[PDB]
Amino acid sequence: KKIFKPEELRQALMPTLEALYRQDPESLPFRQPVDPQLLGIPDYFDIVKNPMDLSTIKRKLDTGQYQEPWQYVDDVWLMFNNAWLYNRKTSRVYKFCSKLAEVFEQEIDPVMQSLG
Ligand SMILES: CCOc1ccc(C(C)=O)cc1-c1cccc(N2CCCC(F)(F)C2)c1
Numbered sequence: 819k820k821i822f823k824p825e826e827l828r829q830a831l832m833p834t835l836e837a838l839y840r841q842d843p844e845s846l847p848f849r850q851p852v853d854p855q856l857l858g859i860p861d862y863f864d865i866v867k868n869p870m871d872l873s874t875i876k877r878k879l880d881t882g883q884y885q886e887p888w889q890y891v892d893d894v895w896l897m898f899n900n901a902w903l904y905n906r907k908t909s910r911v912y913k914f915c916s917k918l919a920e921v922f923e924q925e926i927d928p929v930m931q932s933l934g
Pocket of ligand 1: 843846847848852857859900901904905910911
């Protein structure tokens with residue numbers, strides 16, 4: 819049973835998160851937690867029960883909250899699923915989410931092979 823050290827996870831997985839941050843404009847809606855009052859979308863927390871964003875994932879990596887790589891992947895996918903659930907298919911946020919999911923799939927695969 820492989821035990822992953824926090825710095826091993828940070829060194830392997832942080833570059834995949836940085837690849838999402840580097841997408842501009844597509845990462846802009848995801849860099850900070852959704853603020854429904856500021857954005858004028860007060861129904862947000864009625865629809866999205868478990869919010870997630872890039873800055874929260876980065877903090878979890880920096881503070882050793884993930885014991886296994888799949889837990890990090892689950893949080894990235896939670897962020898994507900929240901955006902596809904909440905936003906309309908024609909919206910900027912939905913299409914930007916779809917682009918981030920393509921980028922993430924490409925970056926995470928070789929990294930998971932290396933962590934095996
Ligand atoms: C359109 C209502 O804002 C949102 C709705 C939903 C969600 C989620 C993640 O479900 C996010 C945002 C959000 C948050 C910050 C910035 C931005 N943007 C600023 C730059 C231009 C832009 F990238 F197109 C959009 C969008």
